[model samples]
Target chain A: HMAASLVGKKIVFVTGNAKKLEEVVQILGDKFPCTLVAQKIDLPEYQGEPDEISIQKCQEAVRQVQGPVLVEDTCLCFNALGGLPGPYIKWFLEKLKPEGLHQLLAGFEDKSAYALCTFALSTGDPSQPVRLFRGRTSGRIVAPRGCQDFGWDPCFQPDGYEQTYAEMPKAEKNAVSHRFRALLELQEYFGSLAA
Target chain B: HMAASLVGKKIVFVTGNAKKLEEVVQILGDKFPCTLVAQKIDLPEYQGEPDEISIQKCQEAVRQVQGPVLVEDTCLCFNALGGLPGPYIKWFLEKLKPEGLHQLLAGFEDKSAYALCTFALSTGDPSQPVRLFRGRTSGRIVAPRGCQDFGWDPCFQPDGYEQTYAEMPKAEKNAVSHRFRALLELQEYFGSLAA
Candidate 1:
């Protein structure tokens, strides 16, 4: 249901990922009274700290776009993998590939893993971050499932679930995904801000 | 003042801290070829690994706003403090205050302190954070100076420098600031991308 509070606010969904773009549009379209504008930003990698980096990047995006923007970064962490991909998921995926990951997990029986997501909302101001929402979903590595999802999703199975993210429907996968949990938290933040 | 390779490129400065934001903008303007964009985002505070928190927060922000966004987080840690404020700078500042910090440094002659900043940049896509930049500037605490800079800057002086950040000019401070060194590394990354 749409909230009466957000009657005519314009929301910009800032990201370069096409999949994420589609997801945000679909999810927010039915709720708040806001128009979603999507833009692609070529952001520089900041390797000092995560909170500072996120806040800095999002602030820059909003400054350039001159509107409200949202920014996010995520990682697939494997405790057994020693956080191999931790914050370097993209690089690890690029260099290691599936074979590399499989090799890392070669002799290990524990393939436990989880995806952690941090969502940030920028109100296009140079103030402290308006809100930060966090969410996590636990899973274990299964055989590479499908090519539909990105990164380690193809080889991961959500805890208490059978199918890998790659094999699951988009809606079904998002239903219990870490990113979804973060979004729900964001919704609550927005609610609180309204109140 | 700008690199030829970075001309016309969009760079997001990810930070909510006003001091850091100003520093990034000045650094990019003075040294890099890219246009600077400041993004402000609200992200959740997750415990455990900094990388995990970073990834989780980044994913959420990315999904909320579709665009090329950069995200980063940072910490001011002390070996003696046992990482008390690793990701809790705000909380620590509130609790410890400047007097508290001085008290912590009391009777301690060997002051081994360094500012550590880790930056992660996701360009509005799911490709993973492509760049990680780390900047560290070692220094020790002294008597508090003027009321120019916030947090520890008033009392903290970078090694090999006589003046605290409050005592030095912005440009002079940027020349040796930990965050500045990290941003320089980011520029190198940008240079490579263009190459």
Candidate 2:
């Protein structure tokens, strides 16, 4: 019923995480050029910063799927920490949780931050290019202000908004989040493609 | 002038740091097999823990040197921080120095740490098989001390020592040091090898 040509061209997501998958499925919708699919294969963690880590992931995914694949890396960067816990935020959050994250900024005057999401796409051919789309949402790090049920969300209050990501309804947060911003371009690229 | 067969079989050390090269030369001494040479090439930083980081470095060094190569990684790990600043100690030291490194343990009861050095070796094969030797010196983080102020050494007081690493004479420090200990293993490995 949607783009007939892209319907069969399934884009395998690199993660098995259901939450992200559900969100992505909602965004791609019926009008999206390519059919969204999920793979259970585990990608090996690469060394160094995000992009370098991503390139390896994209390549690994493309090779593993033997088809088109997408990978998303999320980063929570605190201005006070010099953009650290940037790529390694997951470990920090796990170790210290929201409380410890807030504690790291106690000595600093700047609570500013940005949530970053980068999507890397690679077509089936190993030689084909792995393109990238980076999305960011500016925010400030605060003590837990929303639902304590999620990771770092309660502390990240997006700019021009009174609510923390955790406090906002899924619909509201999804519309303006970093993942959505990045997905905008991804969808745009697909829309322009003939297939 | 020694071990004629092994003499021309050079093992290129993967660093431009003369401080380490001199120390290695001193430890390997005149009887050591294989000529110890060094290259000025820079290795890309990797993500995650020490062994993984070491493996990549070994492979990269062997590929770059296109021959037998040696690579070493130094780690300053705090027990309370859960082995952080392990492989990435360089960035922390550069940004925060000894003060900041010590400050990370301010609220924690354990100041205990180990200065670790690992040496990784590889022969120039694309399927380069890398081997590793790890040596550690136990110590506790302390305020800067000693007449010579150098790096984190002034803050690292070895167990059962009145003098910090910086305070000890270079020869004495080198003898009981982690690098020296790790290099001892490297020397032993070379000694057992037929070549």
**B146: Cα error in model 1, Å:** 46
Off by over 4 Å in 1: A1-7, A16-19, A48-52, A81-84, A107-109, A192-195, B1-195
DockQ top scorer: 2
- Tens-digit lDDT track of model 2 for A110-172: 889999988888776776778787789999988888778898898899998899999999898
* True lDDT of residue A1, candidate 2: 16
What DockQ would candidate 2 receive versus the native complex?
0.24
Interface RMSD in angstroms for candidate 1: 16.6
Cα lDDT for residue A88, model 1?
51
Query: How would the docking of model 2 be graded?
Result: acceptable
State the DockQ of every prediction. Answer: 0.03, 0.24
lDDT of 1 at B139: 76
- lDDT accuracy of residue B175 in candidate 2: 67
- In model 2, pairs of residues that clash are A47-B47, A48-B46, A48-B47
**Candidate 2: lDDT of A153?**
97
